[PDB]
Write a protein that binds this ligand. Structure first.
Ligand SMILES: Nc1ncnc2c1ncn2[C@@H]1O[C@H](COP(=O)(O)OP(=O)(O)NP(=O)(O)O)[C@@H](O)[C@H]1O
Ligand SMILES: Nc1ncnc2c1ncn2[C@@H]1O[C@H](COP(=O)(O)OP(=O)(O)NP(=O)(O)O)[C@@H](O)[C@H]1O
Ligand SMILES: CC(C)c1ccc(CC(=O)N2CCN(c3ccc(C#N)nn3)CC2)cc1
Ligand SMILES: CC(C)c1ccc(CC(=O)N2CCN(c3ccc(C#N)nn3)CC2)cc1
Ligand SMILES: [Mg+2]
Ligand SMILES: [Mg+2]
Lengths: 352, 352
């Protein structure tokens, strides 16, 4: 059977697919046409249907997995379109994680003789993250940080070594946010979560601006000025609040200038998109900072697809975590984005 | 001079006024007409201009303060209307706190010979809170909690004794949120803050629903169903997420169902108002819970005018803090709402 792992989230399905590249002449004869058909379809297309995408830049080439050499592919599509995926599949051992492994269990079993094995979404996240960092990103670091994040003329992406990754705070920003404290390969806990996540960004943006996609919302946000919507410390104090070290530029009240009708009438959609992004991102950073301090952990890695093609939020997290922690915490990022759960699911295949 | 304390916040001005009730016949002769005019104006009206309000139900009667007996009055008006207040005053030693004590310092000095003394907004909050609880609310408890907050048929407001109030986590929900850890009458720290506060509720509500007042936003929220806008755990899992004890009714993604155009087209303004209230309130409770755990404090008192005439948010905080802390934290509330800073400022008068 083809080797897949699937993470069915509240918004996106992520699929990891292992393409063998050590197929012998005898193995090629022995493989059935449908199996060859799937491999050809997945590797000869980068768009699947109208909403599936293969992230070619993330491919791991010539990986040794389960004693075979192959390429590891990364594919995503909206959970809303899973019925189309299952219908394609009806006309294999599937290790699946995320909430949708449970929600859509009965739907996967409409595919005859298909064997579904449900795995925990945070177990798979941890296992996939540790695995990808261990094998490297085609010889490059999987993990990076922003050096000198407080200085724009100096701020730059730099590789970061996670050879001894423990302990580690993992902040998974999907539809909602889960925060994990990882103490060893087999010892972690879900410290807490927040419901102000990527779905809040996308949902509020859609209501406030009429944007029709995540990418459109980020484009609007890149053009906006969040201080047109937010009430800053300097708007309340006339300057810094010196006694407690709060700079005048800090946000005192997100969207707090929208209590004035004249300001609501002048604010732009781009301003509102940027205020939504800044509000969500700062809240995630602040919750992460509080969790890191309580867990006595100084490395905080942010994952999940809220941050895909989202350098604005990544740089805001890098700057804010450094600033508000007085340099005691470091924001870390991973090239593989939102795919760790899907990889972790695939890694569960030998247990079945 | 009249005895005032003033807290000029980012949204509301709060004024505490001590009305002497032990005036002798000689003192009545010796008082100048303008002084009598102010006392008469303040005590014979409950609405001042078009936007000032005296909260008569909060009056402390027959209080002994600075060696005199009198009534303590509580008055509020929008900071936007402070220019009208100052103009009335131009045509006294003023202890003032909040950011506006600094922002509008030069404006107060347009009142001739008026002496402004700026005091710290969180110092005044702590001093005012401890003072009002110490003198009682006309013989009743100033502090209350919701007993059996997990059970609607049992949930009821009950008095709570703060005779030995330390340690105490104080969560001040104004335009933005400050969180204080109070260890003694003279030992406290601002643990952190959040910018998702009362101004976020009012500002987002205004954008999403067109409401024109705080009271209108709460009325809309009382009629709405936040689950029409929020994505719940059961929407992602089909039920509970059992492994980490997350109930299916928990919000996974605030506003997360608004990523679907058809759902944006069916949601009501009342639903959006309630989702805004639930999102802000749960985030405040969660940040408070994390701070209480790190500070090793089990009593959390919520103050600030986000909670005035807002039983919905108070009951949500009572329930959520109890539920998510597994009964280890208790939510406490104070009858005096948003007035503690103004009282603390008034208490600074003897130092000048
Ligand atoms: N093409 C996209 N479509 C929709 N959302 C996107 C897209 N790209 C990035 N995002 C963002 O990524 C988020 C989803 O991240 P993801 O890590 O895939 O969550 P999920 O696994 O589907 N949800 P969860 O069940 O909470 O783990 C969205 O909320 C968006 O903010
Ligand atoms: N009549 C009202 N008008 C405006 N806001 C109100 C009113 N009643 C209650 N509120 C709420 O109370 C909040 C303000 O609380 P308050 O404690 O007075 O803050 P503040 O001191 O003005 N701001 P800050 O500078 O951050 O301390 C608003 O953000 C609203 O959510
Ligand atoms: C005194 C009143 C007017 C007031 C209330 C409220 C605030 C907001 C506040 O106190 N803060 C501190 C914590 N903030 C962050 C942000 C990012 C990270 C990361 N990563 N960490 N913390 C956010 C702003 C300021 C002022
Ligand atoms: C696994 C994915 C799908 C997921 C992500 C995110 C969440 C949200 C979450 O994890 N939580 C726990 C903490 N919550 C509160 C709330 C109030 C208080 C008070 N007072 N404290 N905590 C809020 C919801 C659930 C599920
Ligand atoms: Mg996920
Ligand atoms: Mg205030």
């Amino acid at each position: 059977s083809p080797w897949f792992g699937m993470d069915i989230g509240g918004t996106l399905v992520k699929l990891s697919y292992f393409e063998p590249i050590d197929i012998t002449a005898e193995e090629e004869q022995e493989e059935v046409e449908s199996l060859k058909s799937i491999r050809k379809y997945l590797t000869s297309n980068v768009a699947y249907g109208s909403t599936g995408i293969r992230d070619v830049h993330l491919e791991l080439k010539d990986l040794t997995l389960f004693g075979r050499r192959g390429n590891l592919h990364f594919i995503r599509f909206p959970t809303q379109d899973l019925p189309t995926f299952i219908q394609m599949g009806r006309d294999t051992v599937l290790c699946a994680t995320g909430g949708g492994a449970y929600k859509f269990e009965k739907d996967f079993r409409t595919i005859g003789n298909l064997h579904l094995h449900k795995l925990d979404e945070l177990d798979c996240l941890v296992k996939g993250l540790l695995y990808i960092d261990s094998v490297s990103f085609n010889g490059q670091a999987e993990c990076y940080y922003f050096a000198n994040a407080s200085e724009p003329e100096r701020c730059q992406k730099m590789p970061f070594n996670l050879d001894d990754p423990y302990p580690l705070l993992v902040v998974n920003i999907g539809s909602g946010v889960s925060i994990l404290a990882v103490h060893s390969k087999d010892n972690y806990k879900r410290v807490t979560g927040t419901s102000l996540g990527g779905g809040t960004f996308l949902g509020l943006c859609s209501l406030l601006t009429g944007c029709e996609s995540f990418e459109e919302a980020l484009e609007m946000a890149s053009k906006g000025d969040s201080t047109q919507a937010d009430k800053l410390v300097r708007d309340i104090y006339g300057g810094d609040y010196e006694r407690f070290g709060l700079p005048g530029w800090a946000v005192a009240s997100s969207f707090g200038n929208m209590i004035y009708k004249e300001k609501r009438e002048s604010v732009s959609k781009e301003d509102l998109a940027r205020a939504t992004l800044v509000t969500i991102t700062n809240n995630i950073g602040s919750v992460a900072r509080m969790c890191a301090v309580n867990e006595k952990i100084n490395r905080v890695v942010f994952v999940g697809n809220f941050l895909r093609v989202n350098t604005l939020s990544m740089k805001l997290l890098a700057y804010a975590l450094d600033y508000w922690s007085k340099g005691q915490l470091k924001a870390l990022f991973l090239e593989h984005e939102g795919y760790f759960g899907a990889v972790g699911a695939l890694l569960g295949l030998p247990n079945f």
